[PDB]
Design a protein around this ligand. Structure first.
Ligand SMILES: *[C@@H]1O[C@H](CO)[C@@H](O)[C@H](O)[C@H]1NC(C)=O
Ligand SMILES: *[C@@H]1O[C@H](CO)[C@@H](O)[C@H](O)[C@H]1NC(C)=O
Ligand SMILES: *[C@@H]1O[C@H](CO)[C@@H](O)[C@H](O)[C@H]1NC(C)=O
Lengths: 495, 75, 75, 99, 50
């Protein structure tokens, strides 16, 4: 019931022989899974946590210069010497100034000069790392129990919470009245945490790329540093000025907080203020339906009269949800719900809230269904007195197919070969497609890493034109396909 | 500057929104447009150079686009 | 950001050393070199595409240079 | 001499008074009284709405969030009239002597 | 252009093209910054909150 109301919602139907279904649990979305004679479940990844991160490097984003000193030597007499040059807390530079009789030299050449100032760091951009073993994932499983407040309720008071960690491959959640659900997740194969950094800068965090982070042009410290004064790339945060070949000076070159904020464009923000929480990424799990048993099975049908306590509302995915109350003698009974055609001779709509039941006479069970496109009747209750509600679903089967194709393409865009695990039930075609996707995705990621969407669009246009102007039919079609896929990805990348 | 090395093409993008996706989606194209408006003269000469070098309109147009996109960048 | 419009080709230049003139002179080329080293895959594709598009060797080299210079910066 | 400012840019700011207005789907974009305020920075977005949000229509409900923009650091852009320049020049002859 | 005890001489069109929020210059109380959107970011991860 928690998935009702969420825009990024996925319906998974069926379980493989052996009654397991493989689903991917992205952050910000959720998955509803339906199987014959199995309860409908709502799965949402609501929390990723990284524990005990290790500092990999501290960057300096705001410094200060003090104790500036200079030394000069007459022309041809070599370099000047400064005692501060020995210390690495001092950033120093050698240069030439005009010397002569006027400034105390017997010669009239370019005298060497050295300017040294002490570099002190005022703000840090610490970047931490996490081993995939300390990667607690949190999942909430809520059955489609039909409870009054269950629909779209993120409070989670009525949904079981399971923590997935690499230490235990199998997670068991007992759903009261629905048996036990078994998830076998792969916390190690989601975000590659051994190739990413938890970059924390002034009460903000970002999940960045390890190499990108190590390539940042700022003063830094190795991360194990304790004195915190031997900044390495200090020349990136200081200016040495010799305006007229007369005098050399050193300035500290501002604060780089805003520059870093601009540099972090394209990096997803995270919460490292307390706990290093991540609310991004996915988690591929294998769902075990073996021990899932419908609640309210072995109940008698409800023969009494039902009333609608909240009119039918249509969700964003073509499934309606209605709330009905019961007034009859057999309180714990199962609701006679059907979606017929206008003649009432064909059952057109499928029930998402499979096997609705009236647990309490006074409790307004709410239930979801997927009506067919066009006119239909929602019949609730048995004939003596029964609700007959008319519904019209806008759209089409062709439109739904197009939307499903677009959603699958988008899933293949955010995920790589992992899109082939979202609803797979074994399958030789699925495995072959995932392998081909792995190879093609390797080639594509190699050929397009570190490029913006505009460059991807330009490359796709160029490749499409090249294919269009190829006199080899095979190569022409292949190039056009590659170019169109590149254009689609460039359109769909970012955020 | 760090601002010249953003985190865009790192290949870690999820369905979750990124740091400045809305803002930074068109910032570069806006910059190119503004630069081309403020410096028309380089645009005409880049068009002339592309037309001369490019033997086919595809080559000429591609060269002009690349020149115009790269001139503000180094700038 | 402001850092992306770095007051370079505005005239107004004199004998006196400008601000950050020692570093900004070559930092762009250093950045492009680092990008090309960190992303070998794209450079190969750029060379292949330039060879396909460029009729002569002058056009091919020009297109390849423009592509590899605009790939990181356009980011 | 006598520079005149023509623009004062903000290089560092802060936000203090964040507020949000939310509207159910098909009800149009919401409004905050502080959108009229020029010291507030505002944005219109859309969020998922439904029974769980206390809405009742299951759609994209427009949302508006505003915060007060306060500058903490600015850079002046003073200008000077060309008539106010003054060039100082030193003319020294080769007398071969000292002051 | 004067910025925190450091001043530069810059082109006027370049100065007027800077993407930062600005005041008219006669403004004596702030409170009417123009491009405030250039110095802030609105984040709506998924569609829960802005
Ligand atoms: C730098 O100068 C400060 C005075 O501002 C002084 O206390 C400190 O000892 C000096 N450090 C060195 C290394 O000379
Ligand atoms: C902004 O919040 C402060 C509390 O820190 C309050 O004193 C002030 O009146 C508020 N201003 C508004 C809402 O315009
Ligand atoms: C969600 O559940 C809580 C507790 O179960 C309840 O108080 C609330 O009314 C329900 N509906 C909401 C929060 O929209």
């Amino acid at each position: 019931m928690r998935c009702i109301g969420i825009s990024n919602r996925d319906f998974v139907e069926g379980v493989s022989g052996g009654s397991w279904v493989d689903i991917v649990l992205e952050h910000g979305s959720c998955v509803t899974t339906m199987a014959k004679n199995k309860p409908t479940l709502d799965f949402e990844l609501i929390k990723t946590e990284a524990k005990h991160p290790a500092t990999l490097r501290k960057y300096c984003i705001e410094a200060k210069l003090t104790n500036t000193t200079t030394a000069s030597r007459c022309p041809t007499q070599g370099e000047p010497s400064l005692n501060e040059e020995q210390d690495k807390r001092f950033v120093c530079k050698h240069s030439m100034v005009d010397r002569g009789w006027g400034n105390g030299c017997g010669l009239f050449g370019k005298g060497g000069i050295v300017t040294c100032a002490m570099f002190t760091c005022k703000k840090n951009m610490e970047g931490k790392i996490v081993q995939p073993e300390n990667l607690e994932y949190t999942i909430v499983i809520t059955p489609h129990s039909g409870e009054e407040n269950a629909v779209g309720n993120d409070t989670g008071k009525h949904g079981k919470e399971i923590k997935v960690t690499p230490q235990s491959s199998i997670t068991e959640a007992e759903l009261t009245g629905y048996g036990t659900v078994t998830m076998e997740c792969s916390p190690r194969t989601g975000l590659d945490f051994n190739e990413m950094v938890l970059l924390q800068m002034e009460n903000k965090a970002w999940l960045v790329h390890r190499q990108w982070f190590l390539d940042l042009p700022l003063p830094w410290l190795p991360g194990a540093d304790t004195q915190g004064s031997n900044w390495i790339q200090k020349e990136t945060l200081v200016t040495f000025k010799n305006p007229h070949a007369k005098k050399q000076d050193v300035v500290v070159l501002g604060s780089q907080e805003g520059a870093m904020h601009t540099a972090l464009t394209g990096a997803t923000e995270i919460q490292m203020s307390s706990g290093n929480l991540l609310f991004t990424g996915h988690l591929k799990c294998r769902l075990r339906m073996d021990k899932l048993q419908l609640k309210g099975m072995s109940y008698s049908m409800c023969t009494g009269k039902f009333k609608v306590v909240k009119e039918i509302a249509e969700t964003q995915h073509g499934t309606i949800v209605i709330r009905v109350q019961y007034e009859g003698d057999g309180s714990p009974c199962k609701i006679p719900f059907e979606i017929m055609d206008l003649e009432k001779r064909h059952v057109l709509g499928r029930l998402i809230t499979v096997n609705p039941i009236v647990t309490e006479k006074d409790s307004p069970v709410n239930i979801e269904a997927e009506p067919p496109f066009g006119d239909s009747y929602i019949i609730i209750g048995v004939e003596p007195g029964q609700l007959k509600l008319s519904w019209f679903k806008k759209g089409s089967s062709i439109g739904q197919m197009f939307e499903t194709t677009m959603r699958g393409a988008k899933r293949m865009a955010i995920l790589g070969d992992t899109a082939w695990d979202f609803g797979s039930l074994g399958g030789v075609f699925t495995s072959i497609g995932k392998a081909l996707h792995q190879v093609f995705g390797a080639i594509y990621g190699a050929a397009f890493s570190g490029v913006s969407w505009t460059m991807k669009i330009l490359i796709g246009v160029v490749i499409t034109w090249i294919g269009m102007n190829s006199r080899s039919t095979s190569l022409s079609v292949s190039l056009v396909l590659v170019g169109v896929v590149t254009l689609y990805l460039g359109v769909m990348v970012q955020a | 500057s760090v601002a010249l090395v953003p985190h865009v093409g790192m290949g870690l993008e999820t369905r979750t929104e990124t740091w400045m996706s809305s803002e930074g989606a068109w910032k570069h194209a806006q910059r190119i447009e503004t630069w081309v408006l403020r410096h028309p003269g380089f645009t005409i000469m880049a068009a002339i150079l592309a037309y001369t070098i490019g033997t086919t309109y595809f080559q000429r147009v591609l060269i002009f686009i690349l020149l115009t996109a790269v001139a503000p960048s180094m700038t």
